[PDB]
């Protein structure tokens, strides 16, 4: 029954995401050591080693960084789509509703999972092979210095919940299976799928975190916080699109943001 649904969702998470919290923690603790990006010199060194093709010819450092941000998001959306297709029940949905659920859910899920590669000083990037500092990102020229800091702020509080990958996989499934997204065709069926996943999440947190009797409502609130974080992020991305000609937006991300909020 429900312990099995939880395990199936956790197995789908482990298969489909290149990064998980165990992997990240092994790297962040200190083969393939992460190259630390803390200033312009180390950014340019890291680019030559980790994204060589991007700098083989150059556009401002901030625009190159934002391009790497979007490349990461494109990869994570692909992982999230596979994960979703492995969520028991998702594939029975109307294809239009599958699209809608992913459209509104991917960035909430992205920023939730980003917490796993963040600490108070910085974040893992480039498949675990770079660590870019929080202070360096703050140092970038406006508006690019305003992208990541709200995500670090969310992450520091999210990480203090001490979730593990078995919790996070269910949380991400609950983010995706959300029946109040705009434009859904079969709201009733999606709400029932959501109720099923949230019930499994509730029972799992009771078992896995008997020490924190409010953990489930804390996570319902984090879901609401993420929706607000995404609304704000999309507004910033629109400012960048309109005022930064060199910072082209990738077509999959344009499709996601278009008509979102």
């Amino acid at each position: 029954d429900l312990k099995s649904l939880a395990k199936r969702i956790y197995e789908a998470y482990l298969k489909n995401f290149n990064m998980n919290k165990v992997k990240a923690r092994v790297i962040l603790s200190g083969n393939n050591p992460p190259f630390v990006i803390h200033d312009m010199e180390t950014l340019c060194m890291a680019e030559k080693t980790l994204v060589a093709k991007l700098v083989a010819n150059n556009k401002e450092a901030e625009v190159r960084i934002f391009h790497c941000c979007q490349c990461t998001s494109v990869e994570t959306v692909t992982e999230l789509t596979e994960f979703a297709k492995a969520i028991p029940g998702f594939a029975n949905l109307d294809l239009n509703d599958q699209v809608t659920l992913l459209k509104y859910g991917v960035y909430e899920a992205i920023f939730a999972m980003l917490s796993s590669v963040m600490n108070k000083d910085g974040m893992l990037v480039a498949y675990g092979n770079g660590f870019i500092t929080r202070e360096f990102l703050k140092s970038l020229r406006k508006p690019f210095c305003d992208i990541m800091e709200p995500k670090f702020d969310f992450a520091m509080k999210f990480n203090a919940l001490e979730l593990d990958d078995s919790d996070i996989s269910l949380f991400v499934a609950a983010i995706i299976c959300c029946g109040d997204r705009p434009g859904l065709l079969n709201v009733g069926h999606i709400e029932k799928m959501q109720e099923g996943i949230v019930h499994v999440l509730r029972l799992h947190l009771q078992s896995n975190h008997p020490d924190d009797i409010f953990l489930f409502p804390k996570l319902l609130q984090k879901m609401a916080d993420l929706r607000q974080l995404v609304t704000e992020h999309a507004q910033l991305v629109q400012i960048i699109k309109k005022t930064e000609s060199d910072a082209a937006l990738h077509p999959l991300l344009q499709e996601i943001y278009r008509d979102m909020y």
């Binding site: 297709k85 699209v99 499709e255 008509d259």
Partner: peptide, 10 residues
């Protein structure tokens, strides 16, 4: 309207 997503979903 979401051709890349729709493709990814298949």
């Amino acid at each position: 309207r979401h051709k890349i997503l729709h493709r990814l979903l298949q």
